[PDB]
């Protein structure tokens, strides 16, 4: 699109990129909530 808006994840070393914020959400959620599954 005209404004693809590259969603750059704010994570150390990882900093992945996605097409939507949806994928960034789940991606960041697990990074931040490292306590998940524990």
Swiss-Prot record:
Residues of the full protein shown: 19 to 56 of 505
Record note on domains: The nuclear export signal 1 (N-NES) negatively regulates its nuclear localization and transcriptional activity.
Name of this chain's protein: Cyclic AMP-dependent transcription factor ATF-2
Segments forming C2H2-type zinc fingers: 7-31
Entry PTM: Phosphorylated by PLK3 following hyperosmotic stress. Also phosphorylated and activated by JNK and CaMK4.
Cell compartments where the protein resides: Nucleus; Cytoplasm; Mitochondrion outer membrane
Subunit structure: Binds DNA as a dimer and can form a homodimer in the absence of DNA. Can form a heterodimer with JUN. Heterodimerization is essential for its transcriptional activity. Interacts with SMAD3 and SMAD4. Binds through its N-terminal region to UTF1 which acts as a coactivator of ATF2 transcriptional activity. Interacts with the HK1/VDAC1 complex. Interacts with NBN, MRE11, XPO1, KAT5 and CUL3.
Organism encoding this protein: Homo sapiens (Human)
Phosphothreonine carried by residues: 34
Highest rank taxon of the organism: Eukaryota
Family, per entry: Belongs to the bZIP family. ATF subfamily.
Described purpose of this protein according to its UniProt entry: Transcriptional activator which regulates the transcription of various genes, including those involved in anti-apoptosis, cell growth, and DNA damage response. Dependent on its binding partner, binds to CRE (cAMP response element) consensus sequences (5'-TGACGTCA-3') or to AP-1 (activator protein 1) consensus sequences (5'-TGACTCA-3'). In the nucleus, contributes to global transcription and the DNA damage response, in addition to specific transcriptional activities that are related to cell development, proliferation and death.
Tissue: Ubiquitously expressed, with more abundant expression in the brain.
């Amino acid at each position: 699109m005209s404004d693809d808006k590259p969603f750059l994840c704010t994570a150390p070393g990882c900093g992945q990129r996605f097409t939507n914020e949806d994928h960034l959400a789940v991606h960041k959620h697990k990074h931040e909530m490292t306590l998940k599954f524990g």
